[PDB]
């Protein structure tokens, strides 16, 4: 399949994430995450891959909301996407743990790798946001991942 399939499936959530009735957007986001999962399952995508995808999507959206001024004090902070879908509260470390595993089998996981690259260049920081020297280290991650994607042709 095409390496952009998971990016394509996530485009409504990327737009949604970029502009962040708070209650409203919260609920539409929960519904859309599940709808995307169902759509990709129908297309025959592997459950384990879809759970890694969903995990990263949740962490991405949560970080987008926690970056705002109203985020940490809103209903979203109280019960985040990652908490509702994966029963975890941050995701900032585990996104990169997942990335490292996927990079152990990169041809197999090309589409999810491409998705993670897109998240990174859209500004996802995770653990790098609060790491000393984190901005430079994150740029090294992005450079390595671009090189990997390039080597997968």
């Amino acid at each position: 399949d095409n390496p952009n399939v998971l990016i394509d499936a996530a485009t409504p959530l990327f737009g949604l994430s970029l502009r962040v009735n708070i209650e409203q957007i919260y609920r539409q986001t929960i519904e859309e995450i599940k709808a995307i999962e169902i759509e990709l399952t129908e297309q025959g995508y592997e459950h384990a891959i879809l759970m890694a995808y969903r995990y990263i999507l949740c962490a991405f959206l949560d970080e987008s909301v926690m970056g705002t001024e109203w985020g940490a004090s809103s209903l979203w902070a109280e019960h985040s996407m990652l908490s509702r879908f994966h029963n975890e509260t941050w995701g900032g470390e585990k996104v990169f743990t997942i990335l490292s595993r996927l990079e152990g089998e990169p041809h197999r996981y090309q589409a999810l790798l491409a998705f993670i690259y897109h998240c990174l260049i859209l500004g996802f920081e995770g653990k790098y946001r609060v790491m000393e020297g984190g901005q430079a280290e994150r740029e090294k991650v992005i450079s390595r991942l671009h090189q990997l994607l390039s080597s997968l042709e």
Partner: peptide, 5 residues
């Protein structure tokens, strides 16, 4: 499971 530890 890719989302383990």
């Amino acid at each position: 499971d890719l989302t383990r530890p």
